[PDB]
Design a protein around this ligand. Structure first.
Ligand SMILES: NC(=O)c1ccc[n+]([C@@H]2O[C@H](COP(=O)([O-])OP(=O)(O)OC[C@H]3O[C@@H](n4cnc5c(N)ncnc54)[C@H](O)[C@@H]3O)[C@@H](O)[C@H]2O)c1
Ligand SMILES: NC(=O)c1ccc[n+]([C@@H]2O[C@H](COP(=O)([O-])OP(=O)(O)OC[C@H]3O[C@@H](n4cnc5c(N)ncnc54)[C@H](O)[C@@H]3O)[C@@H](O)[C@H]2O)c1
Lengths: 332, 332
């Protein structure tokens, strides 16, 4: 038995071949995408796994698969928006995703980013660019003496607290629901209390109408002038404009942004001396106190492995059983 | 009682005054370093404490300090290097320092700078200045998925391990004496086992005829090619030409330096516009994967206040007691 995998990265390769071993299933990789040309490559295969943003329209695809008799179309990413569920449905194609990869990936990036700001490192690095090596006024703090606010103590949000609690810090959290598992880890508080008490605020909530622009300028108002803002979740959870405003005015210390508003038109593109599409991107990259990362929180050996492992196991289940825990569709 | 304090900084003032308040002992300050007419500066004062690099061999201070009634000379840093041993014990002058201030200051810097590197942040940042927002090739690693080598698991060395331990790292150490307190937290290995097994290699030893060039041409060629080195201890510890040759030739992946060869002559000075003393420093600033900080490991609220409290309670001891912990010398 064998699976074909598309659009495979060089960093995914280690993880696939570990799973090839484990299950004794043979998997074949290529660097293509799925289009009606390349669908013909499914010929000798019992199933397929893809990765891409490209919306796949042409019914010749779902036909061709069904014609070589694949019973599913699997995506290793969280998003399915490029697969047409109806089209899969009528072709006897069950389509699955991989929503949850290791919550540690993002977490340790929240940690790294935070520590840097805590040590005042971007300012050292600035001074030291010009060979001012003086340390005047840059005295920093120890984590045990910090109180870390977490909004959305989640799968991730929860992992984050656990990290910091372990480092010796003091962890408070704002959440609409309390987990008992976090009982010795966070003290639960209202958003208004957290913002007031917290040296570091880190946003782990999902992006909903509920949470969109949860950080509004009166929430930034509420924060300590020397406190920092860490957003690893989703760009729109934050008011990009109020952020900038607060920063300039020194309402808060600085920030780490892994995700920004309007990033679909910048992160993961070669902008090298093209022009920047976001006036905010342009204004934030000119702020000294602010770090930015291309929504790479996820991107780690163990996280890539999950997407590789899970997405493949979903392929097996559909084949042996006919059902996967991750399936988004029906057939007839 | 009253005590004169020297070379004081803005960061120290708040921590000092709190002590004055606490003990009712009056400490008068100044940004002066102790040299010559600074002798009588001790006039009304019953004790003196200093923070400086500049050495003092001249007896026209010591007799003054004897006559002015000062029974001691106390340093607020761990360094005693600038003090005379003959003149001290004979002039009526005891000499105490602070051997250890908060160990988490230094530990947490190496944890930060390590985490930064594990996450490929310098390469990401480098790309983001080009406005190249692509993440392809930058995959990072989880802490659990790493083996952290500690050379010198001492006060600081051992704090580092507990940390990386808590965050789930497999942690191995190298020391000439093994603490039982670390039996559970670490696995003791030899230097050559360590350099070969570990992804992160962090140095905690003191500068000694023994440790000087512990990381040498050979030690570096032993390390994983994907590994990183973190030197938070002392410049001489690493053979800096070898380190450069090794980053240059990609023998290791990156490095993080809080101390460098001959730092006394560059670190903590505004060299903006001036030429750099070490070609060693010149060259290291152009290597991508390398991170340099001006010996800011110690520098945090707790560690500063530690220095101040301790040193003054070393003085009030040698007055209200006649003896103190960290003193080394005899009498007339
Ligand atoms: N950094 C990356 O590369 C990327 C990858 C993984 C996760 N994502 C993001 O991180 C977040 C992940 O959420 P999750 O799967 O870890 O946990 P989760 O889905 O279990 O839910 C998160 C927590 O946030 C809480 N929250 C919801 N409403 C909020 C309310 N309005 N205010 C207070 N908090 C409430 C929820 O109760 C929940 O417990 C998402 O926003 C997701 O977009 C980032
Ligand atoms: N980064 C900063 O700003 C600054 C501030 C604090 C500490 N300092 C430095 O960090 C180090 C601190 O040492 P410490 O006080 O934390 O611990 P420590 O004084 O208790 O001793 C350190 C450990 O290193 C070990 N070591 C000694 N010889 C070495 C041998 N030759 N090879 C293997 N390891 C052996 C010792 O056994 C000891 O356990 C010093 O070098 C000091 O200079 C850095």
């Amino acid at each position: 038995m064998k699976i074909i995998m598309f659009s495979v990265r060089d960093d995914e390769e280690a993880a696939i071949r570990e799973w090839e071993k484990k299950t004794g299933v043979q998997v074949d990789i290529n660097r293509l995408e799925l289009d009606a040309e390349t669908a013909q490559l499914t010929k000798g295969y019992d199933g397929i796994v893809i990765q891409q943003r490209s919306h796949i329209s042409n019914p010749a695809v779902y036909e061709t698969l069904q014609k070589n008799g694949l019973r599913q179309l699997t995506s290793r990413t969280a998003g399915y928006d490029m697969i047409d569920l109806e089209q899969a449905s009528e072709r006897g194609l069950v389509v699955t995703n991989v929503p949850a990869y290791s919550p540690n990936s993002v977490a340790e990036l929240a940690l790294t980013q935070t520590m840097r700001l805590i040590r005042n490192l971007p300012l050292f690095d600035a001074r030291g660019a010009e060979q001012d090596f003086r340390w005047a006024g840059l005295m920093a703090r120890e984590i045990r003496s910090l109180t870390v606010g977490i909004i959305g103590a989640g799968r991730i949000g929860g992992t984050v607290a656990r990290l910091f609690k372990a480092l010796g810090a003091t962890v408070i959290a704002n959440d609409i629901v309390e987990r008992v598992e976090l009982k010795d880890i966070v003290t639960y508080v209202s958003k208004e209390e957290l913002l007031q008490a917290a040296d570091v605020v880190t946003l782990h909530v999902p992006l909903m109408d509920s949470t969109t622009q949860l950080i509004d300028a009166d929430a930034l108002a509420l924060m300590k002038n020397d406190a920092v803002l860490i957003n690893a979740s989703r760009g729109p959870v934050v008011d990009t404009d109020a952020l900038i405003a607060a920063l300039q005015n020194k309402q808060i210390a600085g920030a780490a942004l892994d995700t920004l508003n309007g990033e679909e038109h910048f992160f993961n593109q070669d902008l090298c001396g093209k022009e920047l599409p976001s006036e905010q991107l342009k204004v934030l990259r000119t702020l000294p106190n602010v770090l930015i990362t291309p929504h790479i929180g996820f991107y780690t050996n163990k996280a890539v492995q999950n997407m590789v492992e899970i997405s493949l196991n979903d392929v097996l289940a559909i084949l042996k059983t006919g059902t996967s825990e991750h399936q988004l569709n029906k057939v007839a």
